[PDB]
Amino acid sequence: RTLWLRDRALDLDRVRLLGVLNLTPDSALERAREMVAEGADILDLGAESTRPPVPVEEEKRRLLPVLEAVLSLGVPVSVDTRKPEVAEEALKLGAHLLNDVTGLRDERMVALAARHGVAAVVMHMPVPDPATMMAHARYRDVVAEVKAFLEAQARRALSAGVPQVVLDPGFGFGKLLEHNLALLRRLDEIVALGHPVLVGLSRKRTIGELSGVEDPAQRVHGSVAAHLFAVMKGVRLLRVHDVRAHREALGVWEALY
Amino acid sequence: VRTLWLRDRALDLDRVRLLGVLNLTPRALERAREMVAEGADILDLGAESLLPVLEAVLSLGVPVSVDTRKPEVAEEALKLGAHLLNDVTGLRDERMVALAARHGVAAVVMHMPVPDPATMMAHARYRDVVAEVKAFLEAQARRALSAGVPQVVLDPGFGFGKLLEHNLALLRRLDEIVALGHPVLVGLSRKRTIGELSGVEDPAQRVHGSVAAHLFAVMKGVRLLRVHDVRAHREALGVWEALYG
Numbered sequence: 315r316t317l318w319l320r321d322r323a324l325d326l327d328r329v330r331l332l333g334v335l336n337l338t339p340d341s342a343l344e345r346a347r348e349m350v351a352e353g354a355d356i357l358d359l360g361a362e363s364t365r366p367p368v369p370v371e372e373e374k375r376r377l378l379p380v381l382e383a384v385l386s387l388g389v390p391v392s393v394d395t396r397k398p399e400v401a402e403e404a405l406k407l408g409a410h411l412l413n414d415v416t417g418l419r420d421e422r423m424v425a426l427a428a429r430h431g432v433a434a435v436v437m438h439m440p441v442p443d444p445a446t447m448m449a450h451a452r453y454r455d456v457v458a459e460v461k462a463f464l465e466a467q468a469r470r471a472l473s474a475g476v477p478q479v480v481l482d483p484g485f486g487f488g489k490l491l492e493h494n495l496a497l498l499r500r501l502d503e504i505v506a507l508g509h510p511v512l513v514g515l516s517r518k519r520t521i522g523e524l525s526g527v528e529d530p531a532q533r534v535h536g537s538v539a540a541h542l543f544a545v546m547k548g549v550r551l552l553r554v555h556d557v558r559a560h561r562e563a564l565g566v567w568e569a570l571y
Numbered sequence: 572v573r574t575l576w577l578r579d580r581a582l583d584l585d586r587v588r589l590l591g592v593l594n595l596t597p598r599a600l601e602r603a604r605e606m607v608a609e610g611a612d613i614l615d616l617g618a619e620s621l622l623p624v625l626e627a628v629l630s631l632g633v634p635v636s637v638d639t640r641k642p643e644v645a646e647e648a649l650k651l652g653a654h655l656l657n658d659v660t661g662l663r664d665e666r667m668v669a670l671a672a673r674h675g676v677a678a679v680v681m682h683m684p685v686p687d688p689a690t691m692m693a694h695a696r697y698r699d700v701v702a703e704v705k706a707f708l709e710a711q712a713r714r715a716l717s718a719g720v721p722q723v724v725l726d727p728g729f730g731f732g733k734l735l736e737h738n739l740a741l742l743r744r745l746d747e748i749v750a751l752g753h754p755v756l757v758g759l760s761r762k763r764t765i766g767e768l769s770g771v772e773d774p775a776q777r778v779h780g781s782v783a784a785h786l787f788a789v790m791k792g793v794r795l796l797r798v799h800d801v802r803a804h805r806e807a808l809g810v811w812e813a814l815y816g
């Protein structure tokens with residue numbers, strides 16, 4: 315199994331890490347270089363917060379400048395945006411992967427991905443808006459519903475020409491602890507859909523709730539634990555903040571499992 | 572479910588239990604109450620390669636495990652109240668088997684090719700390390716019990732007279748040691764195996780690899796972990812046990 319990165323293929327015979335490089339206010343090259351040094355396989359840059367919600371119409375000056383710089387490192391770069399407007403400029407500069415939190419609901423995003431021959435991440439979110447997503451954190455059967463959505467969006471994207479689709483359950487996005495636990499426990503069912511699967515629980519509320527850690531910045535141990543469980547379920551792509559911690563844990567885990 | 576006998580009470584193994592390490596080798600019992608606050612279920616004290624501190628720590632009401640090769644030390648520790656005897660020699664000396672059965676305390680049987688640590692690495696030549704470790708643990712356990720020891724805990728002795736290849740083989744088939752029916756204890760905190768697999772040269776900076784190895788052991792059925800960073804493990808287990816169960 316491999317992941318297409320616009321002009322190169324990354325083998326998923328071992329877990330690959332997407333180092334998060336937030337380009338927002340509260341919660342580049344120097345840190346990007348550090349993550350690469352720590353073992354990041356892909357650098358995931360985002361300029362608009364999807365936290366459970368400030369809309370930013372011209373985030374081009376936020377991202378593109380850092381992006382161009384980061385792309386000079388020679389490492390694959392994932393662009394996290396829900397605006398076709400932003401993606402196009404990102405893809406034209408060299409982006410290798412498009413990470414869309416709105417789950418490719420926008421045809422413009424699908425069209426662009428297909429046009430540039432770039433894979434796209436389809437993430438589940440009950441509704442296209444992060445400001446009200448938590449307001450819709452209710453499902454008849456969350457696993458069944460998230461699975462159906464991911465598969466349907468992936469199908470829609472592929473038949474449109476998108477080379478490949480990566481599925482992401484979207485932990486924490488319009489989901490309460492119970493929903494995240496359910497998805498984690500049955501994550502193998504999403505892996506069984508045949509597409510590469512990506513997950514990211516780094517420092518999320520669910521980790522805080524289960525580990526009893528008040529400060530999001532001190533949740534690395536619960537985050538590593540959740541991610542190892544996901545790896546055990548077949549996931550080979552992880553979105554993380556602490557790259558070194560994960561590389562160290564995986565060094566042990568992959569030699570044992 | 573299964574339990575661990577601790578001199579005057581039983582500890583439920585329905586969930587993973589942590590033995591927090593307190594080494595007193597080359598005073599303030601702060602670290603003691605600190606580890607208990609972090610989530611340690613048992614306090615492991617050892618001053619080998621004690622008594623004054625042991626008496627102080629015991630007043631916390633938390634079970635205390637003592638690590639020693641010398642029976643003279645074990646006796647005085649048991650007489651003071653120690654709840655678990657951890658013999659780092661395979662429980663080869665019938666003198667400490669006698670102390671355990673006499674004080675009615677459980678004893679840990681840890682595997683090592685030979686008693687002396689100065690030459691045990693010269694005895695890391697197993698034809699089948701898993702089979703041989705299993706045979707040894709079972710034999711020592713069968714002997715200790717017949718002698719009156721209330722309960723025995725088995726420890727594969729990672730890093731004791733074992734090459735990386737041996738440690739890996741034991742970890743990968745750990746379920747086979749759990750299948751012997753006794754509570755199993757593992758301690759990979761800061762060990763060379765972790766340094767080798769995680770690429771971390773400084774022993775004090777191996778927490779992430781240690782947590783990963785211990786979660787793997789938990790997945791294999793181990794419910795007792797000897798650890799240095801108590802908090803890091805409690806945090807990881809909070810997530811792991813909620814998910815994997």
Ligand SMILES: Nc1ccc(C(=O)O)cc1
Nearest residue numbers: 364365366486487518519
């Ligand atoms: N973007 C996000 C950041 C954090 C969380 C979360 O903690 O659940 C969810 C989404």
